[PDB]
Amino acid sequence: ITVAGVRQNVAELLDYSNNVKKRNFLETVELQIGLKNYDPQRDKRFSGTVKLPTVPRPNMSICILGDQHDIDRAKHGGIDAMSADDLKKLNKNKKLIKKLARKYDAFIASESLIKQIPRLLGPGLSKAGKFPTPVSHSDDLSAKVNEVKSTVKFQLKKVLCMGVAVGNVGMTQEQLVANIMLAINYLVSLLKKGWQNVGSLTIKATM
């Protein structure tokens, strides 16, 4: 891809689309990738994540699976703390867990609870795309969720097209372009061969 080209593309909307619509949103821009002739029914399916230290996400909805030494820090940070009793009542009710997954699409988990969940309620709802990344031994949750989030999973499905929504109008062109370029470079690296495999890529905004 060409830097000057993505420059007028971000210009085609960050200095035009918003003038055309002028609509009240927490505006986010998405770029979508479709590939020409690599059937997903075959082998070597790709699945990776991006380290994004910008997080144009910040309309956030996060859930935690924390053990002791986390209730107080979660309360101070304004995140609901979930423990063994709360988890066993989620174990009793099997639809409210899906409703709360909808409420908190994003999950984070600790070692003991990620080891304890696969008894019966793990695989039951595992068909939702909630893969919880285990926390490290640093146990310093300050901003660790910030790096854990905004990690887009380039997961290949039975449909041969996908999209990644990164970039808002609150932050500016240099870092939004840096984020999208690094996401594209990671996608090319994860793909089986050269960037020429990509047929068409759209950088147009939400409206």
Add this chain to the structure above:
RNA sequence: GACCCUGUUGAGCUUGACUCUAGUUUGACAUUGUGAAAAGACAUAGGAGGUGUAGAAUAGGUGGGAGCUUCGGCGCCAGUGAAAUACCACUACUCCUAUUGUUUUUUUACUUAUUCAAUGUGAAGACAUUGUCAGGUGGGGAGUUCCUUUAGUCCCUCGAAAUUUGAGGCUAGAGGAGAAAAGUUACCACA
């Protein structure tokens, strides 16, 4: 009456080497041309589409998305569902049309491929016949003396489904002089 054994017979079970090959057989390709008429798949540019169950309802699929404005109807939230509908972005198949093009197959037509007859030219026909590779079987001919199970590292390949499997691969135990016949049975018949 009944029990044991022997011989012949019947019924049943097992064994009867390996390597090439005759024969037989499957598939692909080649001689080998000219046309015409249809069919399939490739090339675009378009058009139309998605009804298992439950769901108000005909839910291609994926993505963001809490609020969308022809400014009144919608969302969201509730349901119901693997999947939820407002907003707007992408490619994925199915069914049709057109020309600014490629191939492959079927039928038909004609001889130049090819086949048959003769000597000091005629008939059939792109089918036969023939040839090259990949293989299957090989109780026949010639020569010489592969699969299955077990336990293991979770070490490698192929196939499948996505959040796991099947088949092979490795280590070393166990099964399978040779087309003349051989072994065997609390069985049958005769003696």
